[model samples]
Target: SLFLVGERLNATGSKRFREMLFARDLEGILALAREQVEEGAHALDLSVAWTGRDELEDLRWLLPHLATALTVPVMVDSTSPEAMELALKYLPGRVLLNSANLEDGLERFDRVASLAKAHGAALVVLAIDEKGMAKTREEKVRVALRMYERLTEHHGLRPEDLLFDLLTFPITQGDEESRPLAKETLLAMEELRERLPGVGFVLGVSNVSFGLKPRARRVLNSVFLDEARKRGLTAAIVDAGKILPISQIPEEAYALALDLIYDRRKEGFDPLLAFMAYFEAH
Candidate 1:
């Protein structure tokens, strides 16, 4: 079963959500969460990362309401260790600490992991470091192994408590350097699952279709989710209502998406071009 972490409640990603949060529209926010739950989300990824606002204040004001109102779990999607600590203290039940990355240093990673351990909250370990997001399969696998070792050997986090995020770049970039990212992410998940058996794999599935037309984004995101799930992706951070069953995608559109994802190209045949042209005309 694919575990979907609903992505609509994010203030940074949704302008309307930003407005709602800024306005402190609690009922409106609950409506969005409920709608996503009804649309098949198994969990909700909540990010109150907004400028000129106190994220902690927002979480304090909102998480308790969600905890009392919702049945599904919530992922506290913030970078601050304080936020993670506050969430673990406030939200009852199994909460997912929406991530720990080596983006600054291992010290930050250790801090976040310690909070997660203390609270017994599941962690999203990103394949990132001081250098930046891992862009290749080897880099991702290496990062996963390092994070896995720290979680298991150092923090004593069980494999079941970890979710490795195999980051996917937008395939809509349509450049040689960018085109194979979807494939790399899928391959990384496959490799990671083999190496770190029993651990979960997740992706921010909508990132793959960023900058595309709305309909095209839905089609591509649905197809990528299907392929990633096949390659051992257990969960996704996505708009719950936008995803379609693989069977629901038109056959030609599905093929085009796969081609773009795999970067399949031949002499005088460019999958990205074909994909863009087809979606544009349709």
Candidate 2:
């Protein structure tokens, strides 16, 4: 079963979510969270990082309500150590700090790592480090392994408490370099699952279909979810309501999505174009 971290509560992407957050409209926010839970989300990811607003204050106001209202776990999706600290302090029950990384030389990394260790909360670890986001499979694995060691040995985080995000790019770019992004992520997941036992893998599942049409995005995300699940993806930050089951997708659409994801194309046949054209017409 996929651990669906419902993505709707995040203000970064949804304009209406940001509006409701800025208004301090707790009812509206709760409605969104409840919808996701009803849609079968195992957890809710709360991200209130909006420009010109106090992220800390936002969390201060929201976390208490969520702690009381939500039955499932909550993931505080903020990059600020201060905000994460607030979540660790105020939020009750099991909480997950949306993410931590070595991108800025482990200053922020150790802060959250220590906080997670102290609070007994699970953490999401990104594969990004001082070298920036790892693109290739080898780079991702290397960075993940290094961070895995640091988190486990140095921070004393158990493997079960760690969730690794290998990072995925949009497949709509349709360039030679962009073609392998999804495939590389799937390949890395297979290797990472074997390398780091008892750990979990997560992804922003809709990223693969960033610019596609609604129907196309649903089909692609569904197919990608199935494929990634087969490769040991344990969780995903996604819109649970939007993602269709594989059996619900039209056979042709699923085949096209698979081809697009794996870069199945010939000298003159571009799977990306075929997917777009087919979806646009239908």
Candidate 3:
């Protein structure tokens, strides 16, 4: 029922994926693709943005193969508008663009936005704007709403096609102050759902636990996905294959995770550290 964009295919995080691309390893990638799709990923978010590789060229080479091998949609995740343009040409379906924003003003993002609009694809627009990331709920909603207007009024795109990313902030991260941005994202999502009807919400789901151990990361991610879903989240960049099976998850993990996501900790207390203490005690 929910849209989960498979995250394992991207070169940005996976060494195996990066190596497979450089070696022109189609069989390996196709095997990986099958794993994600069979696990129920609605789409695959692909980015070949490695240091030495040519992102645009890599994208062009990969798209046609993926188009034939997988039945699901593709999300072109690229900072380069040119690379996005090339990838979109190959993927001819109801697609998702990983993002477009006004970090340096919307000129470049608009190019991709226009392309997404033409292809009838859903556009993921980040909440951050010209200045920087909007850390507070107020700034995030302000920038997100402002950009929604700009995209519709000038970019000739429809409101229904836009997906706003409350630009994920790590809750299980070390800094107590930074974790509040997690609350801000939740608040922003609530406001955006009420204020911008028909617009969707998406996030790179793993970001909220960027510094946590694998066990903690899984707990944080699964619970947060469920919580955010209730608050009108439409999709997330996650590996459906790796989604923790509830029967396999430790009971205490969800209890700790709820405290984190709901911002239920006492003042001056940190959930990550507190959890570590309990885990170490056990």
Stretches off by above 4 angstroms in model 1 are none
**Model 3: residue 203 alpha-carbon error in angstroms:** 0.9
- Tell me how far the alpha carbon of residue 47 in candidate 2 is from the true structure, in angstroms, after superposition: 0.7
RMSD in order of candidates: 1.2, 1.2, 2.0
lDDT of 1 by residue, 117-228 (tens): 8887889999998888999999998888988999899999999998899797998866778989999999888888888889998899999999888888898999999999
TM-score of candidate 1 against the unseen true structure: 0.97
List candidate 3 stretches off by more than 4 Å.
Answer: 245-251, 267-269, 278-282
lDDT, each prediction = 0.89, 0.88, 0.81
Worst 10 residues of 1 by lDDT: 85-94
Q: Where is the poorest 10-residue window by lDDT in model 3? A: 273-282
Error of 2 at 180 (Å): 1.1
TM-score of each: 0.97, 0.96, 0.92
